[PDB]
Write a protein that binds this DNA or RNA. Sequence first.
DNA 1: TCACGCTGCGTGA
DNA 2: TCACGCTGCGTGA
Lengths: 196, 192
Amino acid sequence: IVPANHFGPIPGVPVGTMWRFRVQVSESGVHRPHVAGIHGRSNDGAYSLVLAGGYEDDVDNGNYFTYTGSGGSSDQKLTNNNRALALNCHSPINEKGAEAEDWRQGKPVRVVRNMKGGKHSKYAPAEGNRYDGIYKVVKYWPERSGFLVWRYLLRRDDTEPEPWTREGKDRTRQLGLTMQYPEGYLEALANKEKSR
Amino acid sequence: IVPANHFGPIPGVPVGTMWRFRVQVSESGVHRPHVAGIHGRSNDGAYSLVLAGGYEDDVDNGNYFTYTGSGSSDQKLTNNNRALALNCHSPINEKGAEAEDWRQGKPVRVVRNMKGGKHSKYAPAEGNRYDGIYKVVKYWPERFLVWRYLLRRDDTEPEPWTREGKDRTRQLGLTMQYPEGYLEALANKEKS
DNA sequence: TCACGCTGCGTGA
DNA sequence: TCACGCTGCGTGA
């Protein structure tokens, strides 16, 4: 595997792989937190995040999406994962939001989409978790719920194509990527011979 | 295998049975909720509760303990907290009540989780432990405002922390139950 | 379906 | 240690 604070793609998991649970996504190293949306250290940056349709805003447009941080029922602070993510934007950490001088020079963020994101996004998978590639932070800002939240614009910068495109649907088919289940999960669950 | 809304002990699960995880305690049947403290419908009663030290408002003395409900917001005798109150042998009362002949209330299987050892010597060291049948003696509200219950034990087989009970566990072979493949892959990860 | 809940765990700090 | 948290499940409704 690779270090936890490692930035960028995990070697061997191309764009379009599909795990069923987030523990498989973790063991794969693509997104190490079992539950948390963001993986980051406030002193370094954010290494990976998940879109599971948590926030009633957070508009998902494929190559572009808005995203909201962690905290709170009370105001969100620019600390921990919130601060970690903003560190990737090619701009000095500003406590009032910043924009990127050449956004493509930001730290890379791994991004996977989850079936629960379908509540708000046409780009979610029908099932499980799909690593949709690399994004960079272009902008971040605070806004009002009725409380203050920290939000982020993310643009995609990966060489391999989005899995929902024609080119990407061919990469998913040619590389033979199928929904990967935990060893034993399918076989074990098929046994519903309880009492009746 | 007795329905979900069955009162009293589960056939085949003796007092002192041990499971490492809450999921096996639901497969067992003794306590079907995976997370929730109480199993109970608001017009029938409660079937099982777990002592996992979740609330400041709790005292555990073994043969009896006092228990807390569901809720930084005032509680109500609704849903599960309504359910437990019907297990008391006295008509439901929004002001709290006590049972005359508490032993004719409806049985409640009590599971003890290791997360209660902090404030109870009677909790197990590891995992979960089925400790028999308790009945509701009395229930009342207390100050935020919360609902509390007192539960005495009414089960013929001995408690697993006594001499008689500890003798049943050794002789019945009840040892800590783990999921298949848990110990295998966790020894794997332990050595790394 | 829908929301809840005495979980349980790897990682940041 | 504790803080943290875009899990996941059965459950009543």
